[PDB]
Design a protein around this ligand. Sequence first.
Ligand SMILES: c1ccc(Cn2c(-c3ccc(OC[C@H](C4CCNCC4)n4c(-c5ccccc5)nc5ccccc54)cc3)nc3ccccc32)cc1
Length: 149
Amino acid sequence: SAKDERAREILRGFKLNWMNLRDAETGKILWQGTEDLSVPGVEHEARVPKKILKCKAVSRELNFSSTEQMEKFRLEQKVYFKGQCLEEWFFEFGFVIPNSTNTWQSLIEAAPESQMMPASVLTGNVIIETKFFDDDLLVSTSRVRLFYV
Ligand SMILES: c1ccc(Cn2c(-c3ccc(OC[C@H](C4CCNCC4)n4c(-c5ccccc5)nc5ccccc54)cc3)nc3ccccc32)cc1
């Protein structure tokens, strides 16, 4: 369909340049990466400080480029523990100018009434699956395996 072709074109022109994650309370950068974690069909790996699990809120700064215009750029993200979804997040960026480079800031909060398992239990058993959309059009699905160090 025209929609499937369009999703492939957006993926072709898309790149995640860098990303960092901060403790939202202190503003200190806990993790930073320049690997494009959005690339589909390969399991990405990331080693993060185990103390990030104790942050109630984590602030993300995601820098991306897009050759293609997007009307409603957004993400759906699920955290899986041994294949079971523990949590889901939705974030909306909106309009993307064709051939632009943008920095997107998000606040990722803990789900209320939930207790974090120890880092030693979680390490290597957590997969964060991210779906990139333009409105209801799925552009890509990528996965990151987490190690808490
Ligand atoms: C590094 C980290 C994560 C990614 C994946 N990734 C993200 C993303 C970032 C932070 C996220 O935070 C989710 C939680 C926080 C929530 C607030 N309280 C502390 C725990 N979290 C868990 C956790 C929650 C619940 C249960 C078990 C574990 N493991 C964590 C490990 C690190 C930080 C927070 C972690 C959720 C999604 N954006 C992306 C955009 C594009 C591509 C990939 C992207 C990539 C690299």
